Design a protein around this ligand. Structure first.
Ligand SMILES: Nc1nc2c(ncn2[C@@H]2O[C@H](COP(=O)(O)OP(=O)(O)O)[C@@H](O)[C@H]2O)c(=O)[nH]1
Ligand SMILES: [Mg+2]
Ligand SMILES: [Zn+2]
Lengths: 36, 202
């Protein structure tokens, strides 16, 4: 299965464009929207 | 936590990119508009034998007609589809430019080349001429957005590359908008034959 899938610790998904962002980023690397 | 990939869908204006992405009904009902970049992101779920995967497909708002796309469009792309229109040789002639722009920002992400509108009888870019993919490690498919012909093929190939599982399968097709035009079965069979011969011939 995909049972062994995990995201990087503290990463977050942009609510505007769905890009995954790093834990320490405060804004989306793609669309520049603020972290939810 | 969902497995998802950002997929950029690029190619000349008028090639059918919007028509193609819109075939996936839930991806259309759940699409997200990104005002800062002029993009509609369509979240396309496919159910594999190892679970669901989501391709978040970035569809432009037409800006490719007027110039290159901004860096934000390409940022963090994990895969791509380059589209052209098999009734317009100009759109195939521009495929190397799209590939260049992709690799410049995204390096060696997996890319699929799609020749759209194969439902149209007066086809101009035929299998024997479609060679860009051979020299660049690209996979090629004929597609017809309006008839759903081969809709799933680019996504399955990308999913296999991204996961690293050559045996990955889709256990069911996504719910797609009903075909708007007929893809003639004899025509499809002939085009399928022409591609096979092109891929195997010495
Ligand atoms: N016969 C046919 N027409 C298509 C197909 N896909 C798109 N079209 C039409 O081509 C035109 C451009 O489509 P569009 O999706 O807006 O292209 P885009 O500019 O690349 O996003 C439109 O008139 C579509 O109806 C297809 O598979 N077959
Ligand atoms: Mg469009
Ligand atoms: Zn974003």
């Amino acid at each position: 299965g995909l049972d062994k899938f995990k995201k990087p610790e503290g990463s977050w998904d942009c609510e505007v464009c769905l890009v995954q962002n790093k834990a320490d980023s405060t804004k989306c690397i793609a669309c520049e929207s603020a972290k939810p | 936590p969902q497995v998802q990939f950002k997929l950029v869908l690029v190619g000349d204006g008028g090639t059918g990119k919007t028509t193609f992405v819109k075939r996936h009904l839930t991806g259309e009902s759940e699409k997200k508009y990104v005002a800062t970049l002029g993009v509609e992101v369509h979240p396309l779920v496919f159910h594999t034998n190892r679970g669901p995967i989501k391709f978040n497909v970035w569809d432009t708002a037409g800006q490719e007609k007027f110039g290159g796309l901004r860096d934000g469009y390409y940022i963090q792309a994990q895969c791509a589809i380059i589209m052209f229109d098999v009734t317009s040789r100009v759109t195939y002639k521009n495929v190397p430019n799209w590939h260049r722009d992709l690799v410049r920002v995204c390096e060696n992400i997996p890319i699929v080349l799609c020749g759209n509108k194969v439902d149209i009888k007066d086809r101009k870019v035929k299998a024997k001429s479609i060679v860009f993919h051979r020299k660049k490690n690209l996979q090629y498919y004929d597609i017809s957005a309006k008839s759903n012909y081969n809709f799933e093929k680019p996504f399955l190939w990308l999913a296999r590359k991204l996961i690293g599982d050559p045996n990955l399968e889709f256990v069911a097709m996504p719910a797609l908008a009903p075909p708007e035009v007929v893809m003639d079965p004899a025509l499809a069979a002939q085009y399928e034959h022409d591609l096979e011969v092109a891929q195997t011939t010495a």
